[PDB]
């Protein structure tokens, strides 16, 4: 994963605004625990991926991220995501019952056109603030690399691919019971 290949000519004001508003709407769904409504955004061919990140010497920098055949924090299809949604909305899902309090602050939105019409390659930055129970606070930062398709839903888009690059080697949180 190198520097995102932004197009030289930036996306139009309307398109930039549309995709920003999509992420703001998505963040509201997640932060208000509307998991069913959020799951509807994921397409049937979704690949939801969060690789491991390691400490490497500059000379061995190409090995920073875990590959396709390696373990990861998340490596999910529509089927596995379905099960995760079932857990998080469950009364016996202890890790999120009582639920956490989260904030998805979204910025640094770069929009790129693809070879397919109505399909966009989007790079964005985030800080996820997670507050749990009495006094637990977990702060995550990173970037998301999405493939978004235009959809006739409440948000305007559907998610075809998501890769989350988390700024962490060892996770400082006890779990990842939240969605990025």
């Amino acid at each position: 994963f190198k520097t995102f290949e932004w197009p030289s000519k930036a996306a139009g004001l309307e398109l930039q605004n549309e995709i920003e508003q999509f992420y703001y709407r998505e963040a509201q769904l997640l932060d208000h625990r509307a998991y069913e409504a959020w799951f509807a955004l994921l397409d049937k061919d979704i690949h939801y991926f969060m690789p491991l990140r390691t400490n490497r010497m500059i000379r061995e920098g190409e090995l920073e991220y875990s590959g396709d055949q390696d373990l990861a924090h998340f490596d999910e299809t529509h089927e596995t995501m379905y099960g995760r949604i079932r857990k998080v909305t469950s009364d016996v899902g202890w890790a999120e019952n009582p639920p956490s309090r989260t904030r998805h602050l979204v910025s640094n939105v770069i929009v790129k056109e693809t070879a397919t019409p109505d399909t966009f390659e989007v790079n964005s930055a985030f800080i996820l603030y997670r507050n749990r129970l009495e006094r637990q606070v977990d702060i995550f930062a990173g970037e998301r690399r999405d493939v978004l398709r235009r959809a006739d839903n409440n948000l305007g888009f559907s998610i075809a691919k998501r890769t989350i690059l988390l700024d962490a080697s060892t996770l400082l949180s006890n779990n990842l019971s939240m969605f990025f």
């Binding site: 390691t54 875990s66 055949q69 373990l71 490596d75 857990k87 996770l171 006890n174």
Partner: protein, 433 residues
């Protein structure tokens, strides 16, 4: 002060009682690093983590940073990741390949064996270099897994493991090709004592058979099925090691939990067909019906934990009495089909990473327990470890060793009893098998 007498009072395996102070006391923790972690066999990883000459993995033995590195004679050496000059970390990356190691502080140079080979300005400032290399650990491999021990007077790995070995073989000795690790090491931080985690994989099928993992099972079963239809495995057994505090538990004939966790493809591979039949053949000398063992947990005392059917392996690195790091990876048979290997990767991530549908709920419990132990009254009464008291016996026709029912705490009582012994007996003359 912690006298041997006082330490013996902390655990009672006859009455099945545990003093909660063992999980919280700072002074006890400091003694653990010396008396337990300073002389136990500890898991560093797999042989496949360092396949080629100079390949290294930076890991921990307790709170001591260590380097595990493959030598040119194909042996594996383990030394303290600390320069003896002024304490600088010699190996500063997670993993990779090295031709040599060099301290960034004052430039003391080391070969891949951890021998001090060059000291800058040695002629002008100086002393024997052969005496001033980082401390070496004893290294022993058991069927792919690399263990290390600081103590020269400790028992060898084979004796240390004792009659726990047949239960390790269930995961490790299925094929002539042996096992291999999938790439990647998951690492996360849990604010609980190491003994809660070690005990769970040693003796606690109970939590997975009751309330902790109901949502984890719900996540894994078919979408058409709901919790009330999910089969509840109740048949099974639990093993307590003759010596060492090792323990394992497994379901028999009821693959419900394994099916939900690992899916139908892995379950089939584990129980039916040539690979499963070859595993039974190779494990014939034990007499165990390995194909009937469907879902299993194990701990090699103190901190080497694994799940033989799902092939998840963990080391719990202690970080004070109130914290651990979990370093996790998974193993597959080296000659297993590519489709099976992929299934093992996927479901281990889905179930046992930090975002895992099982793991989420484990940490949730442990976090709350440790927080409770800050209270005075919360440490004033013993915990109940009386499950299966006096029910285990050594003559089971199917499974060797001290064996009881799957939902029991005999393996737990043995873990804590051995913990007590390591903490109270300073000499291997009395401690050893």
């Amino acid at each position: 002060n912690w006298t041997p007498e006082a330490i013996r009072g902390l655990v009672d395996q006859e009455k099945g009682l545990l003093d909660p102070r063992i999980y919280a006391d700072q002074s006890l923790y400091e003694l653990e690093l010396e008396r337990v972690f300073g002389r136990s066999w500890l898991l560093l990883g797999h042989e496949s983590h360092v396949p080629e000459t100079g390949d290294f993995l930076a890991t921990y033995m307790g709170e001591d940073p260590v380097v595990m590195v493959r030598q040119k004679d194909k042996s594996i050496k383990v030394f303290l990741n600390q320069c003896r000059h002024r304490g600088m970390r010699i190996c500063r990356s997670d993993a990779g390949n090295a031709k040599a190691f060099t301290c960034s502080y004052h430039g003391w140079a080391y070969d891949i064996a951890g021998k001090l080979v060059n000291v800058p300005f040695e002629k002008e400032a100086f002393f024997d270099k052969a005496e001033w290399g980082p401390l070496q650990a004893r290294v022993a491999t058991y069927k792919g897994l690399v263990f290390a021990n600081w103590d020269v007077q400790a028992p060898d790995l084979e004796t240390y493991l004792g009659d726990a070995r047949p239960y390790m073989d269930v995961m490790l000795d299925r094929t002539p090709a042996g096992t291999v690790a999938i790439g990647g090491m998951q690492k996360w931080v849990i604010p609980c004592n190491w003994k809660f985690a070690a005990e769970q994989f040693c003796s606690d099928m109970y939590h997975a058979g009751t309330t902790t993992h109901l949502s984890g099972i719900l996540a894994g079963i078919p979408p058409e099925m709901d919790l009330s239809q999910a089969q509840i495995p109740t048949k099974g057994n639990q093993f307590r090691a003759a010596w060492g505090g090792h323990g394992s538990g497994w379901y028999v004939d009821e693959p419900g939990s394994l099916l939900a966790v690992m899916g139908p493809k892995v379950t089939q591979y584990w129980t039916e067909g040539p690979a499963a039949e070859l595993a039974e053949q190779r494990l014939g000398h034990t007499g165990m019906p390995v194909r009937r063992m469907v879902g299993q947990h194990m701990t090699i005392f103190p901190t080497c934990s694994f799940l033989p059917a799902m092939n998840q392996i963990r080391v719990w690195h202690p970080r004070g009495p109130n914290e651990i790091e979990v370093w996790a990876f998974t193993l597959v048979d080296a000659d297993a089909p590519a489709e099976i290997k992929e299934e093992y990767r996927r479901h281990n991530i889905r179930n046992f990473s930090a975002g895992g549908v099982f793991e989420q709920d484990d940490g949730e419990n442990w976090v709350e327990i440790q927080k409770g132990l800050r209270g005075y009254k919360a440490k004033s009464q013993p915990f109940n470890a009386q499950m299966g008291l006096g029910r285990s016996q050594t003559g089971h026709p199917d499974f060797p060793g001290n064996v009881g029912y799957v939902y029991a705490e005999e393996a737990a009582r043995g873990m804590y009893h051995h913990w007590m012994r390591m903490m109270s007996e300073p000499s291997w003359a009395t401690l050893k098998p």
